[PDB]
């Protein structure tokens, strides 16, 4: 789970 939406996820 990330606080932000990540481009490479």
């Amino acid at each position, epitope marked *: *789970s*990330s*606080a*932000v*939406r*990540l*481009r490479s996820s």
Partner: antibody
Amino acid sequence: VQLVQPGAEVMQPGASMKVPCETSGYIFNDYYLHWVRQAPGLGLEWMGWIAPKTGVTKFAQKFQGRVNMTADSSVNTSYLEMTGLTFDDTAVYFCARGTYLPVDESAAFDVWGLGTDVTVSS
Amino acid sequence: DIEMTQYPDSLAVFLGERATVNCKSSQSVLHWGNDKNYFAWYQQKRGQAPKLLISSSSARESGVPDRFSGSGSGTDFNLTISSLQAEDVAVYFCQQYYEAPYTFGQGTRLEIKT
């Protein structure tokens, strides 16, 4: 801070194209580049991105297997390659700057190339 | 894919009056992690590249005049011009950058006259 693209390219049906995007005024490796195309009088279509530092890419499913995106940091340029051109590929190809890679948060496209007008025609 | 649809296709407004464009996404672009909408609006004039106006639903870019504002959350967004100026005639596009593919809709804005 800008992205430089050539005005126009004319290619033949069935041929390959290679559209460049030369970065200015910032560090080439630190941002994602995106390609967005616009057929005459129509919408914007997102094609894919490239993280120039690592060459890692992601393409929209409909362009998978006919596109590539590559980077040459020695000339601060990144390239869109597409094969099997048809009349439906006639469009303006814009490159645009998104996400700052060290932080990697998905970002809107703040800086755009003027676009390369690509005409597929014999 | 997240499908974006703008309403209306075409908008006519008298100079000095309020113009509003709607966008709907087929899925929410609101991230639980930071409570941010990964939603932008772009202006495109005839023969030019798109220009980013608004990111995060409502954050104006540097130099975008404050007659432009954005609103909405999740799946439903508006771009509002409080007072239409001549320089604002353009096509306006929404975009989600929540997940790839990073999709656009399309919206045409003109001056209304007799």
